[PDB]
Design a protein around this ligand. Structure first.
Ligand SMILES: CCCCCCCCCCCCCCCCCC(=O)OC[C@H](COP(=O)([O-])OCC[N+](C)(C)C)OC(=O)CCCCCCCCCCCCCCCCC
Ligand SMILES: CCCCCCCCCCCCCCCCCC(=O)OC[C@H](COP(=O)([O-])OCC[N+](C)(C)C)OC(=O)CCCCCCCCCCCCCCCCC
Ligand SMILES: CCCCCCCCCCCCCCCCCC(=O)OC[C@H](COP(=O)([O-])OCC[N+](C)(C)C)OC(=O)CCCCCCCCCCCCCCCCC
Ligand SMILES: CCCCCCCCCCCCCCCCCC(=O)OC[C@H](COP(=O)([O-])OCC[N+](C)(C)C)OC(=O)CCCCCCCCCCCCCCCCC
Ligand SMILES: CCCCCCCCCCCCCCCCCCCC(=O)O[C@H](COC(=O)CCCCCCCCCCCCCC)COP(=O)(O)OCCN
Ligand SMILES: CCCCCCCCCCCCCCCCCCCC(=O)O[C@H](COC(=O)CCCCCCCCCCCCCC)COP(=O)(O)OCCN
Ligand SMILES: CCCCCCCCCCCCCCCCCCCC(=O)O[C@H](COC(=O)CCCCCCCCCCCCCC)COP(=O)(O)OCCN
Ligand SMILES: CCCCCCCCCCCCCCCCCCCC(=O)O[C@H](COC(=O)CCCCCCCCCCCCCC)COP(=O)(O)OCCN
Ligand SMILES: CCCCCCCCCCCCCCCCCC(=O)OC[C@@H](O)COP(=O)(O)OCC[N+](C)(C)C
Ligand SMILES: COP(=O)(O)OP(=O)(O)OCC[C@H](C)CC/C=C(/C)CC/C=C(\C)CC/C=C(\C)CCC=C(C)C
Ligand SMILES: *[C@@H]1O[C@H](CO)[C@@H](O[C@@H]2O[C@H](CO)[C@@H](O)[C@H](O)[C@H]2NC(C)=O)[C@H](O)[C@H]1NC(C)=O
Ligand SMILES: *[C@@H]1O[C@H](CO)[C@@H](O[C@@H]2O[C@H](CO)[C@@H](O)[C@H](O)[C@H]2NC(C)=O)[C@H](O)[C@H]1NC(C)=O
Ligand SMILES: *[C@@H]1O[C@H](CO)[C@@H](O[C@@H]2O[C@H](CO)[C@@H](O)[C@H](O)[C@H]2NC(C)=O)[C@H](O)[C@H]1NC(C)=O
Ligand SMILES: CC(C)CCC[C@@H](C)[C@H]1CC[C@H]2[C@@H]3CC=C4C[C@@H](O)CC[C@]4(C)[C@H]3CC[C@]12C
Ligand SMILES: CC(C)CCC[C@@H](C)[C@H]1CC[C@H]2[C@@H]3CC=C4C[C@@H](O)CC[C@]4(C)[C@H]3CC[C@]12C
Lengths: 203, 49, 150, 52, 86, 49, 204, 150, 150, 150, 150
């Protein structure tokens, strides 16, 4: 658990530092320096928007790959004694990849809303552009993380389904319903991302 | 209807990979002023093929 | 006009598209080589057939290299924040997608080389799963090509 | 006099970030290296069962 | 110089591919196809008066391509001789 | 049908107000036909959709 | 230490100190610290102190063959997202012969109850460039170690001095967030690579 | 305008190019050395033939050295932040791609040299997988050159 | 007129060069010593001959010391920030390359000294792998010298 | 004038020079003591001869003490920031090189006294490896002395 | 004359009141469900009698909901920072007290149902312990109400 120890140490140190820093800023009357407004505002909307698109695609692909390996290991292991698994349970892989297809679709939809400003002063950048960056970032987070979780869930369920099919052929047809239910979550994330970026306009 | 976008995905990927291969391999053998480049195009095109 | 630091994000996007794809392809190659080595002691005739997952990991690395080269050839002195962050997003997309696709290819190939060693029919199934695992990184590359040329 | 402000350098952000993250990286590298050496395999596994 | 028939077959197929494709590339360069403008090794000065300089560079690249095609023709002849030997 | 119709209808002069079929399909599903933004592709679009 | 320029209206209202104060016309620089800080006959006329608007006008008579006047225009107002009044040096205005040259002041802001400080509030790019323009100007300024308090000034002392020097800047923040995302990705990848294990046995 | 700190990123690019490439090459060399040591207790005749993974790790280190010296020979005093970012990105790409390639070469070479004591026919498979791992470091080097010599 | 804080990175470069190199040499010495002690119980005649990896680790430490002394003699009160960053980068490169090289030397030396107890023909293979590992510290030293004396 | 916090870094240099040298010496002494106990359970006659690793760890502690006292005596109220940085770098160098040397000496002494409990001929190899481990602390001392006296 | 970020703390109070109470109730329900499932294979008749821990965890969740709705209805646009902090304190108090009570109920219910499968008399003791665990969350609710209705 060396790497987990390192991560836990970093987390604890960072958040102890944050606690003491917040106590200092509040108590020493230096709160006006902790300008979250200035952070969110000076930080360019392009950073948020492009991080959002990148996350939308990358996390969707991460979930698709996670599920694909989770279920393909089981498919190939079971098929050593019952090769029909390879031909039948490719549907789990298909779902895990539909996750990434949703990811790219939403990356396209988000990227279609990008446009330069030609301004640097926040009053010039305006609510429209700032909210556009924030909402593209949020939509990317939504789609990417929902797709990641849906892909992992479908992969786990598909590994289970492949293992169960390796022993009795008539079970996969009934266990695919769990895969469908797990797939619905990616669709929900896509719908929410689309709603978020519905009225988004950079320029 | 979403997954049929893999047609466009794979087509664009093939086109871009071919373009980058061309521009990184045989552009080297073609973008040479000296006539001695005709000999280099030999090996550069072997690699391209 | 533009901040002197605007090119940092584009440079880092190219670096990421290369590095994360290289890590994913390295994981794929390592896992597939472990599987091939474990299998070969009993089935030497399957090494060439089973070298496919290594090739697909190489293809992930090639996608990473392509996007990194695009961004590196697009960087310029006056690169605006818009282009810089577009290239950062493209690099993140390609890098993380290639990383995950390489992980999946490595795991699936390590499983399927050993499986095909036992059951010859599993070879085509392993290939079928691996092509999906690879087109995940391909989807990353597609989004990168959309972005870096938005 | 006049309660003049402390003559902070304008590049405070740059120098603070450089020093903070450089020293954090150096400290983390030292911690990781020392951890690997401390938790290094004792190497006398051929002798643990002879003494014990 | 005897060698494997597999290597000879690969050499001859590569020679045929190179000859055909490089001859076509040279013909297109000589025709001054605008598609291959990026492959011409011109400089800033070449845009001074007119397109004659770029045409000359096109012809130079076409000559390079024809030289490569001839070298591949010799390679294919060597591979064919090796095939006849085997 | 929408794709083909947009191809056949909208040209360079009408480029400025050329609608996005992605947004129009989203609005078709959401019943979110707005009074602002890109205009309708054709007359009666709201009712037909 | 030369005293700050202190415009009083029944009491010190605008305090202005600058370790160095140099101005350039057509690249002809001149030091004004000695003629600004400590001089008892400073031509402060033209200054003004509203309750929520301050204008400090420093005029030099023989400077560059004309009577020049530099007006620092600051305004403080109540910002609804807090209960605190914030003051910002809105701009700078140099009046030469029947003419005006305007400089925007970028990052001179802070709570009214706190003076503002910044090293190199200057028009030069090498020196921060807090005085900026888009219309090319014949004037340049450098106020090395510039500290100003226009509102809530009590007595002769500058109140606590919020300053431009921060731990982070916008560029550092963007870079840190990008590098943090990349560090997370690289840590995930390195974890999955270090988790690779080799077989300890081979089949008979 | 060309801040005093602009050269830090280029210097760290050189340092990273050397360091991470050296770490990857060291990992490959060490793992392949353990594998060779385990193998040679029973197959002495393959000690010298099986050192190839060590050679490929050394080649990764050579890529790192090339890019590090290339950057170090381009660090002028008034280096623009854009150029320094380019050098940092080139160094990161080469170093971390070499690190991943070193991981891959270590794993693959150790497994291959240990399994070739069992199956002599696995030597060519191990060599091919090691070539696929080395081309990752070569891609890193290519992107690093494109960036640094930009 | 130069910043008073410029010498910090130079002193950190010197300290890092002598610290990370010392850590790598310590790892190499410790691991090779454990291997030598384990071997000696059965093959005492190989102690002197097997002390070699310890010598390689010592040479890594010597690289670190050399670069540290170079920096500690190049430091000056008015050291410019560019030169100070150069010293920091050279120190990082030498120290961390020596760290990786020392880790590789330790692992390889332990494995090879244990194996040579069983297969005497593995001595030359061990020596070659240890040379390949030491060359990483040599590359680190070369890049450090370039950057420091630049 | 000079900043009032300048002396902080020099004080930290002295404190670190002592602290990390003491930590390394403590680790060496602890491991050597465990090894000495395990050895003396069957070879009492070597109880005194096996204390050498402890002596070497104490010598590393002495290096730390010397550098700490040197920095302490060199400190002054108006110590220039550059001198303070020099002292901090020297202290860190000595302390962490001594910590690495203490690690090496502890592991080597543990394994070596255990081995010498069974093979007397390994005693000389143990001394040689302990010397190669103590030279790391000596190198740290050299660098710290250069930086402090400078 | 109040900050427009004042409502942030009160909103976090309501959100925490619901969220942490829900997490504690989820832990209680999950652990008690695992226990009930484990014990139901052998002793089915005790399922309904043993469903008590789930009910108690649900009551904890209801405490959280009550305080969350109270805060949500107490929220206002011009909520003074004082009232906002009061609502944040009440939300944290109820949420985390319910979280602790949910952990206690989970452990105690698991152990109690598993034991009551074996020892019928233990049912009443388990009920008493669950009552104490619930009383913890009740205390949290009391404090949250006092804070949120000042
Ligand atoms: C168990 C852990 C050990 C406890 C200590 C933990 C480490 C904390 C020390 C960090 C190093 C910082 C030292 C001071 C640096 C100089 C700062 C400075 O100039 O101050 C100006 C700051 C800010 O400016 P100011 O307030 O002085 O100026 C006036 C500002 N206005 C007008 C707006 C009000 O204030 C001080 O003077 C602070 C002096 C004391 C600071 C001491 C460190 C604070 C943190 C202490 C620990 C907090 C947790 C306590 C409980 C722990 C129990 C486990
Ligand atoms: C570990 C899990 C996370 C929880 C702990 C960490 C949370 C916060 C971490 C992020 C960094 C620090 C954030 C705060 C930054 C300072 C903001 C600031 O100065 O403005 C304050 C603001 C505004 O300050 P102000 O000076 O403007 O005051 C208002 C003045 N008027 C109205 C005139 C404008 O007000 C507050 O005090 C808000 C409360 C939050 C600040 C305190 C943070 C507390 C951190 C945790 C310690 C809690 C103490 C008790 C310990 C036991 C806990 C159970
Ligand atoms: C160990 C794992 C590796 C590390 C990973 C985690 C890294 C965490 C990142 C750290 C950066 C934190 C932000 C720094 C800026 C905020 C500092 C601050 O609030 O003070 C200045 C603020 C604002 O200062 P100011 O605004 O008056 O200063 C003038 C402004 N400048 C300096 C920019 C010109 O308040 C003070 O003045 C406080 C003075 C005392 C300093 C108190 C700092 C808190 C931390 C000290 C103890 C350390 C905690 C850790 C405990 C041990 C480990 C668990
Ligand atoms: C492929 C990914 C690999 C993993 C991730 C690693 C990537 C590391 C990249 C370098 C660090 C960059 C951090 C963010 C800053 C980006 C630059 C930027 O935008 O700045 C422009 C800004 C622009 O300035 P500005 O205009 O924003 O500032 C306002 C104006 N002034 C400055 C006057 C107040 O300037 C800088 O250069 C800022 C300084 C940033 C320094 C950050 C410290 C980084 C430390 C490096 C890591 C530690 C090394 C030692 C390791 C030891 C061994 C392991
Ligand atoms: C707990 C006390 C207080 C601590 C406070 C200080 C801050 C925390 C620092 C760590 C403190 C504990 C010591 C841990 C040392 C490092 C972790 C273990 C050793 C280690 O890293 O080696 C192996 C990983 O390889 C490596 O060495 C690779 C590591 C290097 C990667 C660096 C990239 C990460 C950068 C950080 C940003 C990411 C943030 C993510 C949240 C893990 O060994 P094992 O577990 O397999 O074997 C079991 C034994 N090691
Ligand atoms: C027990 C544990 C601790 C619990 C307590 C809560 C801890 C929360 C940690 C966050 C920090 C505390 C929140 C209050 C401080 C906010 C900053 C106030 C400082 C200030 O004056 O800033 C204003 C802007 O702030 C603003 O207007 C910013 C508004 C938003 C503040 C809250 C945002 C915090 C981050 C939330 C992220 C959530 C992520 C969810 C996934 C000034 O601005 P001005 O308009 O006067 O400018 C005038 C320029 N001339
Ligand atoms: C020129 C070079 C660069 C200069 C910069 C560096 C300056 C010095 C600071 C870096 C650290 C130097 C000291 C080395 C620490 C030794 C690490 C030993 C690790 C180890 O084996 O300990 C493990 C615990 O880890 C741990 O507990 C982790 C180590 C403890 C963390 C050290 C940091 C302390 C916190 C700092 C607070 C102050 C911060 C500023 C406010 C135990 O292993 P196991 O878990 O298997 O144990 C089972 C048996 N017991
Ligand atoms: C060695 C490896 C490579 C280098 C390391 C790169 C990766 C690490 C970097 C990650 C960030 C770590 C440091 C976070 C600092 C938190 C806030 C500090 C508080 C503070 O004093 O900040 C004030 C501004 O912050 C604000 O205005 C508040 C904004 C807080 C936002 C924090 C969001 C990110 C961190 C937490 C969430 C993480 C999840 C991802 C979102 C300073 O004020 P000033 O005086 O400079 O102001 C000037 C004008 N007023
Ligand atoms: C192994 C088996 C063998 C494999 C065979 C592969 C064959 C591949 C041969 C081609 C490869 C290179 C592709 C280059 C294509 C570009 C050439 C091109 O554009 O051609 C046409 C140009 O010359 C003319 O167009 P223009 O001068 O721009 O305009 C003038 C045109 N008007 C008059 C019609 C208006
Ligand atoms: O030319 P341009 O590329 O510039 O843009 P255009 O608009 O003019 O033409 C593009 C025409 C076409 C619409 C382009 C095709 C692009 C597609 C991204 C998405 C196709 C996928 C579909 C319809 C199913 C997946 C769901 C997706 C959004 C969510 C819908 C479902 C719900 C809301 C429940
Ligand atoms: C303020 O700075 C000015 C320059 O901006 C200083 O005067 C200059 O001194 C330098 C160095 O001797 C000369 O090259 C310049 O010619 C001088 N003046 C000008 C107008 O260029 C001046 O001494 C400083 N005053 C202080 C610190 O009170
Ligand atoms: C004191 O300063 C005032 C204000 O500048 C001088 O009076 C006039 O000020 C206006 C506005 O800046 C200028 O346009 C005029 O040129 C100034 N008049 C003159 C005659 O210079 C006033 O002169 C200054 N008094 C002294 C004694 O120098
Ligand atoms: C100083 O304060 C007075 C009020 O005491 C300001 O009067 C306002 O002036 C502004 C700017 O012209 C107008 O928008 C307001 O309508 C005026 N009335 C009020 C009641 O605020 C006066 O303007 C300020 N001084 C200056 C020079 O602007
Ligand atoms: C010990 C041996 C094996 C190391 C590897 C060979 C060395 C001598 C060679 C191989 C290629 C060489 C590099 C090739 C190109 C350049 C670019 C030039 O602008 C600076 C020198 C530099 C960066 C060279 C440095 C030395 C180098 C790295
Ligand atoms: C452990 C013991 C036996 C080692 C002793 C070796 C002697 C000859 C070495 C060790 C450290 C050396 C010192 C290291 C650094 C300095 C500072 C320099 O400005 C003058 C020389 C001086 C003072 C050196 C003189 C020689 C020296 C004292």
């Amino acid at each position: 658990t060396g790497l987990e120890l390192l991560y836990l140490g970093i987390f604890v140190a960072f958040w102890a530092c944050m606690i003491v820093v917040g106590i200092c800023y509040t108590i020493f009357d230096l709160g006006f320096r902790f300008d979250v407004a200035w952070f969110l505002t000076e930080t360019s909307p392009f950073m948020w928007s492009n991080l959002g698109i990148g996350l939308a695609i990358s996390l969707s692909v991460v979930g698709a790959a996670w599920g694909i390996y989770i279920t393909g290991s089981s498919i190939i292991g079971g098929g050593v004694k019952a090769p029909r698994i390879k031909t039948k349970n490719l549907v789990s892989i298909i779902f895990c990849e539909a996750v990434a297809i949703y990811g790219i679709i939403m990356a396209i939809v988000i990227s279609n809303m990008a446009e330069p400003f030609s301004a640097t002063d926040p009053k010039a950048i305006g609510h429209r552009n700032y909210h556009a960056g924030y909402s593209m970032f949020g939509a990317g987070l939504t789609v990417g993380l929902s797709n990641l979780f849906c892909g992992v869930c479908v992969g786990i369920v598909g590994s289970g389904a492949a293992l169960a099919d390796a022993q009795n052929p008539s079970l996969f047809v009934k266990i695919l319903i769990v895969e469908i239910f797990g797939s619905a979550i990616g669709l929900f994330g896509v719908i929410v991302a689309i709603l978020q970026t519905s009225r988004v306009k950079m320029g | 209807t979403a997954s049929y976008l893999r047609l466009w995905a794979l087509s664009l990927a093939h086109a871009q990979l071919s373009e980058v291969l061309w521009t990184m391999v045989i552009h080297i053998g073609l973008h040479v002023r000296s006539l001695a480049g005709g000999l280099g195009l030999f090996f550069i095109f072997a690699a391209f093929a | 006009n533009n901040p002197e630091y605007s090119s940092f994000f584009g440079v880092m996007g190219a670096s990421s598209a290369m590095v994360f794809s290289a890590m994913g392809a390295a994981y794929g190659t390592a896992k597939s080589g472990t599987g091939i080595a474990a299998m070969s002691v009993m089935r030497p005739e399957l090494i060439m057939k089973s070298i496919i997952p290594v090739v697909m990991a190489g293809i992930i690395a090639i996608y990473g290299l392509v996007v990194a080269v695009l961004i590196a050839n697009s960087l310029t002195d006056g690169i605006t924040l818009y282009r810089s962050f577009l290239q950062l997003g493209a690099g993140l997309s390609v890098g993380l997608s290639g990383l995950a696709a390489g992980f999946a290819i490595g795991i699936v190939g390590d499983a399927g080389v050993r499986g095909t060693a036992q059951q010859p029919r599993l070879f085509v199934g392993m290939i079928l799963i691996l092509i999906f695992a690879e087109v995940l990184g391909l989807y990353g590359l597609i989004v990168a090509l959309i972005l870096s040329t938005k | 006099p006049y309660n003049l402000a402390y003559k902070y350098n304008l590049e405070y952000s740059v120098v603070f970030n450089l020093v903070l993250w450089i020293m954090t990286g150096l400290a983390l590298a030292v911690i990781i290296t020392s951890y690997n050496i401390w938790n290094m395999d004792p190497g006398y596994d051929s002798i643990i069962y002879r003494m014990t | 110089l005897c060698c494997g028939p597999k290597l000879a077959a690969c050499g001859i197929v590569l020679s045929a591919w190179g000859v055909i494709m490089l001859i076509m590339l040279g013909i297109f360069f000589n025709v001054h196809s605008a598609v291959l403008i990026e492959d011409v090794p011109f400089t800033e000065k070449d845009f001074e008066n007119g397109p004659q300089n770029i045409y000359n560079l096109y012809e130079q690249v076409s000559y390079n391509c024809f030289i490569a095609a001839g070298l591949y023709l010799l390679l294919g002849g060597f591979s064919f001789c090796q095939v006849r030997l085997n | 049908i929408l794709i083909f119709y947009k191809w056949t209808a909208y040209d360079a002069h009408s480029s400025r107000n050329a609608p996005s079929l992605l947004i129009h399909f989203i609005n078709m599903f959401l019943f979110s036909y707005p009074e602002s933004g890109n205009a309708m592709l054709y007359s009666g679009q709201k009712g037909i959709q | 230490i030369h005293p700050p320029v202190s415009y009083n209206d029944t009491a010190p209202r605008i305090l202005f100190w600058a370790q160095n104060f140099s101005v350039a016309y057509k690249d002809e620089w001149k030091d004004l610290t000695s003629l600004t800080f400590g001089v008892e006959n400073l031509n402060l006329t033209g200054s003004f102190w509203n309750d929520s608007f301050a204008m400090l006008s420093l005029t030099y008579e023989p400077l560059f063959g004309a009577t020049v006047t530099f007006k620092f225009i600051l305004a403080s107002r109540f910002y609804p997202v807090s209960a605190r009044y914030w003051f910002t040096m809105e701009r700078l205005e140099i009046h030469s012969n029947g003419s005006v040259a305007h400089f925007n002041v970028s990052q001179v802001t802070g709570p009214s109850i706190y003076s503002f400080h910044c090293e190199y509030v200057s028009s030069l790019s090498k020196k921060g460039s807090l005085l900026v323009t888009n219309v090319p100007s014949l004037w340049q300024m450098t106020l090395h170690n510039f500290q100003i308090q226009a509102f809530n000034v009590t007595g002769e002392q500058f109140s606590y001095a919020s300053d431009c020097a921060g731990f982070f800047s916008p560029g550092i923040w963007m870079g840190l967030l990008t590098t943090l995302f990349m560090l997370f990705i690289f840590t995930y990848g390195l974890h999955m690579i270090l988790s690779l294990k080799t077989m300890d046995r081979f089949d008979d």
